[PDB]
Amino acid sequence: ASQVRQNYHEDCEASINKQINMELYASYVYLSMAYYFERDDVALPGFAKFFKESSDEEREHAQTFMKYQNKRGGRIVLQQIAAPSMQEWGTGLEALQAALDLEKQVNQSLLELHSTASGNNDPHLTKLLEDEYLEEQVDSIKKIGDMITKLKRAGPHGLGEYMFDKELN
Amino acid sequence: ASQVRQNYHEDCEASINKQINMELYASYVYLSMAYYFERDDVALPGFAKFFKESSDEEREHAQTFMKYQNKRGGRIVLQQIAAPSMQEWGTGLEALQAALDLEKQVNQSLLELHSTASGNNDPHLTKLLEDEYLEEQVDSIKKIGDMITKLKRAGPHGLGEYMFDKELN
Amino acid sequence: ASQVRQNYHEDCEASINKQINMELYASYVYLSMAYYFERDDVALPGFAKFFKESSDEEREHAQTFMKYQNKRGGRIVLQQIAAPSMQEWGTGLEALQAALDLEKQVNQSLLELHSTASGNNDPHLTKLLEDEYLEEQVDSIKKIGDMITKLKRAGPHGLGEYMFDKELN
Amino acid sequence: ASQVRQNYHEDCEASINKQINMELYASYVYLSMAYYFERDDVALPGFAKFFKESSDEEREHAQTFMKYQNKRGGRIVLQQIAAPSMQEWGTGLEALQAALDLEKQVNQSLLELHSTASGNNDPHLTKLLEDEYLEEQVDSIKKIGDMITKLKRAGPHGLGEYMFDKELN
C-alpha cells in the first residue's frame, strides 16, 4: 500500500471514487443548464450565472475529493461522465426543481458515505464530510427551496420570471 | 491609379462604396427610431438610448469604410441617403424586430462583400471584414434576439415594456 | 430556426458539438494527469500544476465553443465524456508525450473544422478558429516539444526530472 | 471533582496525560534530529530547519492537550520524557523514514484516543481530536511521504541530497 495509508478502508476509498464521478456529473448538468439559459430564445442571464457558478462549485467538490483520496493514499479511478438527462431544461422554475432534486440526491449519497465512514471508524473522513460537504449541501438545498418559493410568488412566468431573474443577475 | 494601390480590384472598390451608403442608411434609420422613442407620447428612454448608440455605431462603420477606401487608394463616391422606410416605429418590440431585420440585411451584404473579396484574392480586405465588421454584426444580431426574447417575456406591452425599457436605460 | 441564425450550416453546427466533447475530454485527461502527479509516490508538483492549468484551459475552450454555438443560433448537444485512456501516466516524460499526441489530435480536428467552415463559406467561423484556437494550439504544441527536449536534456529521470519539475513549479 | 467537570470520563482524562507525554517525546526526538543536521560533518540546514519546526509543533500539541485537560477539569500528570531512541540519525532519508514511522505511531494513538472518547460519548473531545489533531497528523504524514519520494528521485545521496535540502531551507 502507500507509505501514507493509515486507517483507510477499501470501501471508503471506492465510495470516494464514486462520489467524484457523481460531483463531476452534477457539474456537467449545471454546465448544460447554464448554456441553456444563454440561448437567444431563453435569455435568462441570472439563471445562466446561477447555474455556471453551481457548475464550478460542483467541479471544485470533485477536486477536493480527488485531493482527499491522495491525501489518505487512496488511488483515484475516473470513470465516464454521463451526458446530462436533458438537453433543454424548460422554464426557470423547472430547472430549479431539477436542481433541487439533484442536490438532494447528492446529499443522500454524501450521507451514505458518512455512514460508511462511521461504520469503519474513520473519524478523519467523517470530519471532512461534515466540514466540507454536508453543511454546504444543506445550505445549497435551502437556497434552492427559497428561490423556488420566491419564483412561484413573483412569477413563475412572464414578468415575474423576468424580475426574479434580475435579482439573480 | 493611386501611387498606393495594390491588389485592389474595382469591384471591391465599388462594393465598399455601396456598403458605405448602406451603413449611413442604417445610421439614419436608427436616428429616426431614437427620436421616435423620445416623443412625449412614447417616452421610452431606454429604447431611445439604445437606438441613438446604434445610430452612432453605424456611422462609425461607414467612416471606417471611408478610411479603408482611401487606405487602399480607392476613391470614395457618396450617394443619396434614402429616407427611413417609416416615420413612426410602433411599439418597442416592433422597433426591435425592424432592427433585427435591418442588422441581418447588413450582415448579408457584408458576407457578399467578403465573398467578392475572396473571389479577387484580396486577403487584406477579407481580414478587415472578419476583424472589424462580421464579428460585431453577429454580436449585434445576438444581442437584439436576446432583447426580443426578454421583452416578450417581460411584456411586451404595459408594465413589462416599462420595466424592460428601464434595464436598457 | 433561431431568429439569429444566418449563414450557419448544420454541418458546422454538429462539428462544433463534437469539438466541445473533444475539448471536455482533453480537460478530463489533463485533470487525471494533474492528480496523478500529486500522488504521494509521484510527488512532481510542477507537472501537477502544468496539467491542472492545461485542464482548466481545455475546459475554457469547450465553453468558448458552447457560447459560440448559441451566438450563431446553433443548439448545444452534450454527450458522454469518456474516461481517460489511462489511470496512471508513468514518468513526467511519458505524460508529456501523451500530452503532445493529444494536443496534435485536437489541432487536427480543429483544422478539419476549419476546412468544413471554409467549404461552407462561413468566414465568421474561420475567423474564430484562427483567432481563438489555432494560434493557441500551435503555441501549446511548441511549448510541449520544448519541454520534452529540456526534460530529455536535464533528465529524463532521477535528479534531472526533479530539477526540471522545479522550473515548472 | 472540579467545579467545571462535566461528562468527562477518567479514562479520557488519563489517556490525554499519556498523549501529552507522547507529543513531548516526539518533540524531543525532532529536537535531536534538528541538531544532528547542524553538525559540522552533516551540514544539512534544510533538514535541520524542518525538524526544528516539527519539534516546536509537537510541543505546541502537548500544550494544547495540557490546556484541554484544565479546560475540562482534568488534572495534568507529567511523566518522564524518555531519551530519543538514537543520538545520530544517519542520512536525510533515514531521518525522514524514522519521522514518518513516528508520525504514524502518533496518529495511531490519537485515533485510539478518539475511539476511547466515542466509547464514552464525549463529543467535545471527539471534536477536539478531529479539528486540532487528526487533520494536521494526516497532512504531516502526507507531507513526509511526498518528501521521501522527492528525495528518492533527486538523490537520495550526493548532489541530490544537497539539492533537495536546499528546497527545504
XYZ file of C-alpha atoms in Angstrom:
676
model
C 0.000 0.000 0.000
C 1.019 3.632 0.044
C 3.581 4.677 2.624
C 0.957 7.183 3.914
C -2.082 4.959 4.245
C -3.484 4.513 7.685
C -6.959 3.543 8.958
C -8.366 3.960 5.456
C -10.801 1.298 4.399
C -11.114 -0.003 0.766
C -14.850 0.697 0.776
C -14.292 4.339 1.841
C -11.695 4.551 -0.920
C -14.053 3.137 -3.575
C -17.017 5.200 -2.323
C -14.962 8.418 -2.757
C -14.237 7.401 -6.366
C -17.939 7.103 -6.971
C -18.619 10.415 -5.290
C -16.027 12.111 -7.581
C -17.916 10.742 -10.634
C -21.113 11.920 -9.125
C -19.965 15.542 -8.420
C -18.458 15.733 -11.924
C -21.805 14.639 -13.366
C -23.623 17.332 -11.396
C -21.104 19.870 -12.680
C -21.867 18.809 -16.206
C -25.628 19.010 -15.680
C -25.285 22.537 -14.343
C -22.991 23.494 -17.224
C -25.791 22.295 -19.543
C -28.321 24.452 -17.741
C -26.136 27.488 -17.739
C -25.730 27.474 -21.512
C -29.381 26.538 -21.983
C -30.238 29.873 -20.244
C -27.981 31.852 -22.637
C -29.853 30.661 -25.751
C -31.126 33.616 -27.688
C -34.656 32.224 -27.306
C -34.348 31.870 -23.494
C -32.153 34.800 -22.458
C -32.311 34.461 -18.621
C -28.868 35.672 -17.647
C -29.452 35.437 -13.897
C -30.319 31.727 -14.175
C -27.322 31.274 -16.504
C -24.963 32.839 -13.940
C -26.503 30.860 -11.068
C -26.001 27.533 -12.824
C -22.499 28.356 -14.151
C -21.421 29.089 -10.583
C -23.076 25.894 -9.377
C -21.197 24.023 -12.174
C -17.904 25.463 -10.915
C -18.685 24.652 -7.272
C -19.550 21.011 -8.132
C -16.258 20.663 -10.032
C -14.359 22.037 -7.005
C -16.064 19.412 -4.771
C -14.879 16.665 -7.100
C -11.386 18.055 -6.931
C -11.481 18.299 -3.191
C -12.324 14.565 -3.127
C -9.583 13.822 -5.639
C -7.120 15.649 -3.343
C -8.513 13.832 -0.315
C -8.085 10.459 -1.953
C -4.323 11.147 -2.489
C -4.039 12.664 0.955
C -5.064 9.289 2.512
C -3.051 7.217 -0.027
C -6.064 6.071 -1.957
C -5.896 5.827 -5.735
C -8.135 7.918 -7.935
C -10.160 5.969 -10.527
C -12.000 8.137 -13.051
C -14.972 6.848 -14.996
C -17.177 8.047 -17.778
C -19.160 11.144 -17.176
C -22.633 10.565 -18.451
C -24.498 13.034 -20.703
C -26.998 15.176 -18.764
C -30.504 13.685 -18.697
C -31.903 16.674 -20.676
C -30.573 18.931 -23.465
C -33.250 21.623 -22.702
C -34.479 22.427 -19.274
C -37.830 24.149 -19.888
C -38.680 27.160 -17.622
C -36.560 28.680 -14.847
C -38.830 27.030 -12.415
C -38.344 23.555 -13.906
C -34.596 23.909 -13.918
C -34.639 24.840 -10.236
C -36.870 21.846 -9.432
C -34.431 19.575 -11.260
C -31.555 21.236 -9.382
C -33.245 20.776 -6.082
C -33.808 17.072 -6.833
C -30.193 16.765 -7.993
C -28.786 18.432 -4.876
C -30.880 16.133 -2.700
C -29.508 13.024 -4.472
C -26.025 14.365 -3.907
C -26.767 14.920 -0.238
C -28.128 11.427 0.102
C -25.026 9.875 -1.396
C -22.828 12.097 0.886
C -24.761 10.893 3.935
C -24.414 7.281 2.767
C -20.675 7.928 2.512
C -20.729 9.371 6.038
C -22.438 6.230 7.328
C -19.833 4.095 5.548
C -17.083 6.130 7.161
C -18.663 5.907 10.641
C -19.114 2.142 10.159
C -15.367 1.828 9.503
C -14.354 4.124 12.393
C -12.683 6.697 10.167
C -13.045 9.964 12.037
C -10.796 11.887 9.605
C -13.249 11.058 6.829
C -16.429 11.804 8.897
C -14.900 15.214 9.750
C -14.165 16.015 6.061
C -17.732 15.190 5.126
C -19.100 17.257 7.994
C -16.924 20.318 7.378
C -16.613 20.469 3.636
C -19.692 18.844 2.127
C -22.696 18.311 4.379
C -23.029 21.951 5.550
C -22.656 23.369 2.047
C -25.137 20.810 0.671
C -27.797 21.774 3.261
C -27.203 25.460 2.558
C -27.473 24.897 -1.157
C -30.762 22.909 -0.832
C -32.162 25.676 1.495
C -31.169 28.286 -1.013
C -32.894 26.471 -3.958
C -36.119 25.954 -1.942
C -36.179 29.702 -1.107
C -35.552 30.555 -4.735
C -38.395 28.226 -5.822
C -40.764 29.877 -3.346
C -39.728 33.357 -4.484
C -40.091 32.497 -8.127
C -43.523 30.951 -7.523
C -44.569 34.181 -5.783
C -43.124 36.550 -8.303
C -43.989 34.615 -11.431
C -43.376 31.848 -12.147
C -43.761 33.036 -15.765
C -43.884 36.244 -17.713
C -42.867 39.462 -15.977
C -42.262 37.719 -12.664
C -39.850 35.287 -14.197
C -38.083 38.288 -15.787
C -37.945 40.212 -12.482
C -36.824 37.219 -10.462
C -34.067 36.536 -12.998
C -32.792 40.122 -12.461
C -32.334 39.534 -8.775
C -30.208 36.556 -9.574
C -28.056 38.530 -12.055
C -4.115 54.926 -60.468
C -3.109 55.948 -56.986
C 0.574 55.582 -56.062
C -0.645 53.335 -53.198
C -2.976 50.981 -54.989
C -2.030 47.352 -54.989
C -4.106 44.130 -55.408
C -7.317 46.152 -55.061
C -9.968 45.181 -57.522
C -12.510 47.735 -58.965
C -15.409 45.563 -57.866
C -14.133 45.545 -54.278
C -13.749 49.316 -54.554
C -17.324 49.844 -55.838
C -18.808 47.324 -53.376
C -17.294 49.323 -50.469
C -18.921 52.489 -51.836
C -22.252 50.724 -51.708
C -21.598 49.438 -48.228
C -20.783 52.994 -47.040
C -24.203 54.139 -48.335
C -25.791 51.217 -46.682
C -24.234 51.804 -43.223
C -25.168 55.510 -43.447
C -28.721 54.459 -44.228
C -28.795 52.183 -41.199
C -27.458 55.081 -39.118
C -30.272 57.267 -40.318
C -32.924 54.636 -39.599
C -31.634 54.267 -36.067
C -31.536 58.042 -35.582
C -35.230 58.083 -36.564
C -36.015 55.393 -34.015
C -34.094 57.110 -31.295
C -36.086 60.340 -31.614
C -39.322 58.397 -32.134
C -38.765 56.959 -28.628
C -38.307 60.451 -27.120
C -41.729 61.683 -28.278
C -43.809 62.835 -25.340
C -46.404 60.206 -26.260
C -43.876 57.351 -26.400
C -41.368 58.240 -23.657
C -39.189 55.066 -23.688
C -35.778 56.474 -22.856
C -34.003 53.104 -22.783
C -35.036 52.336 -26.356
C -34.105 55.928 -27.276
C -30.592 55.494 -25.877
C -30.199 52.026 -27.423
C -31.067 53.328 -30.887
C -29.011 56.524 -30.586
C -25.957 54.448 -29.782
C -26.732 52.090 -32.660
C -27.034 55.146 -34.969
C -23.580 56.332 -33.854
C -22.026 52.902 -34.297
C -23.444 52.527 -37.866
C -21.985 55.953 -38.732
C -18.571 54.859 -37.363
C -18.759 51.717 -39.594
C -19.338 53.905 -42.664
C -16.395 56.019 -41.681
C -14.174 53.050 -41.134
C -15.020 52.009 -44.699
C -14.379 55.520 -45.987
C -10.923 55.433 -44.350
C -10.317 51.928 -45.713
C -11.197 53.066 -49.239
C -8.508 55.796 -49.039
C -6.047 53.451 -47.364
C -6.119 51.140 -50.453
C -6.158 54.078 -52.934
C -9.774 53.677 -53.836
C -11.950 56.720 -54.376
C -14.949 57.362 -52.204
C -18.216 58.063 -54.064
C -21.098 59.221 -51.854
C -24.724 58.834 -52.902
C -28.081 59.946 -51.708
C -29.111 58.641 -48.308
C -32.693 57.471 -48.512
C -35.394 58.487 -46.032
C -36.121 55.770 -43.457
C -38.959 53.449 -44.508
C -41.065 54.590 -41.502
C -41.559 57.848 -39.591
C -43.147 56.020 -36.566
C -41.944 52.701 -35.382
C -44.898 51.415 -33.314
C -44.022 49.523 -30.036
C -40.566 48.772 -28.672
C -40.999 45.271 -29.780
C -41.745 46.305 -33.398
C -38.746 48.583 -33.474
C -36.502 45.743 -32.336
C -37.948 43.410 -34.979
C -37.238 46.014 -37.632
C -33.733 46.452 -36.183
C -33.098 42.748 -36.216
C -34.208 42.513 -39.854
C -32.016 45.515 -40.706
C -28.942 44.083 -38.987
C -29.393 40.789 -40.841
C -29.573 42.679 -44.166
C -26.361 44.483 -43.322
C -24.734 41.203 -42.349
C -25.770 39.661 -45.640
C -24.357 42.490 -47.710
C -21.102 42.243 -45.577
C -20.841 38.496 -46.321
C -21.428 39.163 -50.018
C -18.628 41.707 -49.850
C -16.447 39.032 -48.168
C -17.165 36.557 -50.993
C -16.274 39.282 -53.540
C -13.025 39.904 -51.718
C -12.200 36.179 -51.521
C -13.041 35.814 -55.224
C -10.469 38.520 -56.041
C -7.857 37.077 -53.613
C -7.688 40.231 -51.526
C -6.713 38.922 -48.113
C -6.247 42.441 -46.631
C -9.916 43.070 -47.383
C -11.154 39.638 -46.104
C -9.263 40.331 -42.833
C -10.859 43.791 -42.374
C -14.312 42.321 -42.809
C -13.525 39.489 -40.396
C -11.854 41.640 -37.703
C -13.988 44.799 -37.864
C -17.462 44.040 -39.204
C -18.508 40.385 -39.180
C -17.865 39.673 -35.506
C -19.614 42.875 -34.428
C -22.575 42.206 -36.720
C -23.067 38.699 -35.233
C -22.816 40.098 -31.723
C -25.304 42.781 -32.504
C -27.826 40.336 -34.017
C -27.425 38.024 -30.948
C -27.954 40.956 -28.660
C -31.237 42.014 -30.431
C -32.639 38.462 -30.447
C -31.930 38.257 -26.693
C -33.572 41.603 -26.182
C -36.633 40.487 -28.185
C -36.985 37.327 -26.089
C -36.656 39.301 -22.862
C -39.148 41.871 -23.921
C -41.566 39.127 -24.985
C -41.150 37.530 -21.552
C -41.408 40.704 -19.542
C -44.053 42.424 -21.624
C -44.190 43.006 -24.468
C -46.628 45.787 -23.501
C -47.724 47.726 -20.482
C -45.710 47.364 -17.283
C -43.324 44.855 -18.801
C -42.460 47.186 -21.625
C -41.854 49.918 -18.963
C -39.645 47.599 -16.873
C -37.674 46.300 -19.842
C -37.089 49.847 -21.048
C -35.504 50.505 -17.645
C -32.874 47.672 -17.955
C -31.878 49.349 -21.147
C -31.573 52.897 -19.752
C -34.765 28.151 -36.864
C -33.435 30.661 -34.391
C -34.253 34.332 -35.030
C -30.456 34.898 -35.039
C -29.269 32.201 -37.382
C -27.601 33.332 -40.545
C -25.093 31.612 -42.915
C -24.577 28.836 -40.356
C -24.500 25.409 -41.863
C -25.812 22.274 -39.986
C -22.505 20.506 -40.501
C -20.624 23.393 -38.878
C -23.160 23.259 -36.051
C -22.730 19.489 -35.499
C -18.930 19.650 -35.885
C -18.784 22.228 -33.044
C -20.810 19.869 -30.837
C -18.204 17.210 -31.444
C -15.385 19.616 -30.768
C -16.994 20.601 -27.427
C -16.997 16.905 -26.414
C -13.469 16.609 -27.539
C -12.153 19.622 -25.557
C -14.022 18.382 -22.456
C -12.348 15.017 -22.920
C -8.938 16.657 -23.124
C -9.794 18.593 -19.957
C -10.605 15.378 -18.187
C -7.403 13.674 -19.333
C -5.364 16.575 -18.029
C -7.256 16.573 -14.725
C -6.285 12.891 -14.379
C -2.642 13.715 -15.016
C -2.645 16.576 -12.597
C -3.829 14.417 -9.692
C -1.604 11.533 -10.813
C 1.364 13.881 -10.224
C 0.170 14.722 -6.682
C 0.212 11.085 -5.525
C 2.485 10.650 -2.538
C 4.544 8.180 -4.578
C 4.957 10.541 -7.546
C 5.184 13.992 -5.921
C 6.013 16.135 -9.012
C 4.232 19.371 -8.196
C 5.426 21.232 -11.299
C 3.899 18.632 -13.606
C 0.782 18.666 -11.395
C 0.402 22.432 -11.796
C 1.173 22.305 -15.532
C -1.548 19.721 -16.138
C -4.112 21.368 -13.848
C -3.742 24.584 -15.797
C -3.995 22.690 -19.082
C -7.194 21.016 -17.772
C -8.674 24.449 -16.996
C -7.698 25.869 -20.372
C -9.275 22.904 -22.272
C -12.498 23.435 -20.287
C -12.471 27.158 -21.216
C -12.095 26.160 -24.924
C -15.188 23.944 -24.665
C -17.063 26.790 -23.089
C -15.978 29.238 -25.712
C -17.426 26.826 -28.280
C -20.617 26.434 -26.266
C -21.008 30.239 -26.243
C -20.188 30.389 -29.960
C -22.851 27.778 -30.731
C -25.501 29.963 -29.017
C -24.115 33.124 -30.582
C -24.854 31.727 -34.101
C -28.222 30.205 -33.040
C -26.977 26.670 -33.027
C -28.121 24.258 -30.352
C -25.660 22.692 -27.981
C -25.861 18.886 -27.667
C -23.725 17.395 -24.884
C -22.583 13.778 -24.937
C -20.899 11.376 -22.628
C -17.365 12.290 -21.627
C -15.216 9.197 -21.872
C -12.896 8.009 -19.100
C -9.247 8.897 -19.758
C -7.346 6.127 -21.562
C -5.007 5.703 -18.542
C -5.362 5.944 -14.756
C -1.531 6.234 -14.255
C 0.649 8.150 -16.588
C 4.130 6.739 -15.849
C 7.062 9.289 -15.824
C 6.868 13.016 -16.488
C 8.327 12.396 -19.827
C 5.601 9.863 -20.761
C 2.885 12.218 -19.634
C 4.288 14.967 -21.841
C 4.484 12.607 -24.827
C 0.854 11.676 -24.298
C 0.010 15.385 -23.961
C 1.839 16.238 -27.132
C -0.005 13.492 -29.024
C -3.304 14.700 -27.542
C -2.691 18.333 -28.482
C -1.851 17.308 -32.050
C -5.126 15.337 -32.261
C -7.038 18.373 -31.072
C -5.216 20.545 -33.584
C -6.103 18.149 -36.369
C -9.781 18.095 -35.505
C -9.651 21.988 -35.300
C -8.114 22.169 -38.802
C -10.753 19.766 -40.113
C -13.368 22.046 -38.594
C -11.661 24.998 -40.358
C -11.834 23.189 -43.723
C -15.544 22.455 -43.081
C -16.124 26.112 -42.336
C -14.212 27.246 -45.443
C -16.147 24.712 -47.537
C -19.422 26.291 -46.364
C -18.112 29.878 -46.826
C -18.585 30.787 -43.182
C -15.942 33.439 -42.633
C -17.174 34.272 -39.084
C -16.396 30.676 -38.143
C -12.987 30.541 -39.961
C -12.010 33.739 -38.072
C -12.974 32.288 -34.651
C -10.868 29.219 -35.294
C -7.944 31.343 -36.477
C -8.102 33.937 -33.663
C -9.074 31.740 -30.698
C -7.984 28.141 -31.245
C -5.388 27.567 -33.962
C -2.763 30.010 -32.713
C -3.088 28.757 -29.135
C -2.931 25.120 -30.237
C 0.327 25.739 -32.174
C 1.799 27.579 -29.210
C 0.840 24.809 -26.884
C 2.355 22.092 -29.108
C 5.599 24.164 -29.428
C 5.705 24.590 -25.698
C 5.367 20.783 -25.043
C 8.036 19.874 -27.618
C 10.393 22.370 -25.928
C 9.551 20.915 -22.563
C 10.208 17.374 -23.849
C 13.618 18.386 -25.210
C 14.530 20.102 -21.948
C 13.448 17.201 -19.862
C 15.395 14.823 -22.113
C 18.468 17.027 -21.660
C 18.123 17.527 -17.943
C 16.903 14.060 -17.064
C 14.691 12.478 -18.088
C 14.844 10.611 -14.755
C 16.276 10.996 -11.309
C 17.757 14.357 -10.343
C 17.096 15.880 -13.738
C 13.438 15.020 -13.559
C 13.403 16.629 -10.048
C 15.170 19.776 -11.311
C 13.009 20.116 -14.409
C 9.877 19.714 -12.310
C 11.103 22.716 -10.308
C 11.342 25.078 -13.373
C 7.751 24.207 -13.952
C 6.517 24.855 -10.391
C -14.218 16.884 41.481
C -13.612 20.208 39.804
C -16.488 22.666 39.748
C -16.178 22.624 35.910
C -16.122 18.908 35.218
C -18.940 17.524 33.183
C -19.273 14.386 31.020
C -15.529 13.806 31.271
C -14.513 10.230 31.820
C -11.447 9.171 33.935
C -10.103 7.091 31.051
C -10.281 10.077 28.650
C -8.518 12.100 31.334
C -5.735 9.519 31.790
C -5.404 8.923 28.030
C -4.795 12.679 27.487
C -2.000 12.542 30.086
C -0.371 9.782 28.115
C -0.812 11.657 24.867
C 0.919 14.735 26.406
C 3.930 12.522 27.302
C 3.865 11.120 23.850
C 3.827 14.508 21.993
C 6.602 15.782 24.285
C 8.672 12.715 23.396
C 8.159 13.348 19.685
C 9.218 16.956 20.227
C 12.390 15.756 21.852
C 13.138 13.286 19.060
C 12.749 16.031 16.481
C 14.914 18.386 18.541
C 17.585 15.646 18.434
C 17.305 15.404 14.670
C 17.428 19.106 14.150
C 20.738 19.478 15.968
C 22.059 16.288 14.382
C 21.627 18.055 10.981
C 23.631 21.109 12.164
C 26.739 19.037 12.981
C 29.689 20.340 11.055
C 30.073 16.883 9.491
C 26.405 16.739 8.358
C 25.554 20.344 7.489
C 22.014 19.887 6.033
C 20.372 23.117 7.102
C 17.072 22.444 5.338
C 16.610 19.174 7.259
C 17.677 20.984 10.453
C 15.018 23.677 9.939
C 12.354 21.107 9.026
C 12.914 19.100 12.199
C 13.249 22.152 14.495
C 9.854 23.333 13.268
C 8.422 19.850 13.740
C 9.888 19.875 17.304
C 8.095 23.158 18.012
C 4.800 21.936 16.532
C 4.887 18.733 18.648
C 5.499 20.811 21.791
C 2.511 23.035 20.910
C 0.308 19.902 20.564
C 1.332 18.802 24.045
C 0.457 22.218 25.361
C -2.860 22.227 23.613
C -3.647 18.948 25.426
C -2.410 20.377 28.712
C -4.787 23.337 28.208
C -7.597 20.982 27.224
C -7.133 18.887 30.330
C -7.636 22.002 32.558
C -10.463 23.200 30.363
C -12.460 20.015 31.217
C -11.323 19.981 34.892
C -8.926 17.121 34.452
C -5.598 17.162 36.264
C -2.336 17.180 34.370
C 0.142 14.441 35.359
C 3.595 14.800 33.807
C 5.954 11.866 33.492
C 9.499 11.279 32.429
C 10.392 12.125 28.912
C 12.485 9.338 27.543
C 15.778 9.890 25.671
C 15.360 9.653 21.882
C 15.997 6.150 20.525
C 19.034 7.392 18.513
C 21.761 10.014 19.077
C 22.617 10.084 15.301
C 20.088 9.722 12.584
C 22.152 8.662 9.553
C 21.151 10.187 6.147
C 18.362 12.676 5.420
C 16.414 9.850 4.002
C 16.699 7.719 7.151
C 15.633 10.568 9.368
C 12.536 11.111 7.239
C 11.704 7.387 7.372
C 12.006 7.484 11.160
C 9.836 10.622 11.201
C 7.232 9.034 9.045
C 7.109 5.992 11.354
C 6.957 8.302 14.378
C 4.116 10.395 12.953
C 2.175 7.229 12.169
C 2.536 5.983 15.775
C 1.289 9.345 16.954
C -1.677 9.135 14.615
C -2.491 5.663 15.823
C -2.506 6.730 19.448
C -4.683 9.793 18.524
C -7.179 7.505 16.787
C -7.183 5.171 19.802
C -7.946 8.231 21.926
C -10.761 9.140 19.525
C -12.239 5.658 19.893
C -11.997 5.967 23.682
C -13.785 9.296 23.511
C -16.525 7.948 21.201
C -16.946 4.933 23.512
C -17.601 7.317 26.420
C -19.943 9.597 24.429
C -17.751 12.669 24.783
C -18.475 14.726 21.693
C -16.448 17.734 22.923
C -13.371 15.512 22.992
C -14.066 13.795 19.598
C -14.415 17.291 18.064
C -11.067 18.475 19.540
C -9.320 15.438 18.129
C -10.959 15.905 14.743
C -10.263 19.636 14.454
C -6.907 20.060 16.091
C -5.001 16.798 15.743
C -6.259 14.275 13.207
C -6.255 16.639 10.184
C -2.800 18.014 10.954
C -1.450 14.488 11.538
C -2.726 13.273 8.130
C -1.290 16.362 6.447
C 2.033 15.869 8.152
C 2.235 12.150 7.149
C 1.285 13.116 3.516
C 3.956 15.752 3.520
C 6.698 13.328 4.763
C 5.730 10.670 2.170
C 5.983 13.310 -0.608
C 9.323 14.456 0.739
C 10.583 10.838 0.822
C 9.503 10.324 -2.788
C 11.142 13.582 -3.874
C 14.350 12.807 -2.069
C 14.460 9.302 -3.562
C 14.058 10.861 -7.020
C 16.535 13.638 -6.562
C 19.144 11.726 -4.609
C 18.870 10.173 -2.147
C 22.605 10.861 -1.677
C 25.273 13.142 -3.012
C 24.228 16.121 -5.117
C 20.554 15.194 -4.964
C 20.553 15.149 -1.213
C 22.248 18.579 -1.330
C 19.702 19.975 -3.823
C 16.714 18.537 -2.007
C 17.985 20.019 1.263
C 18.050 23.474 -0.420
C 14.389 23.268 -1.254
C 13.662 22.612 2.361
C 15.778 25.592 3.515
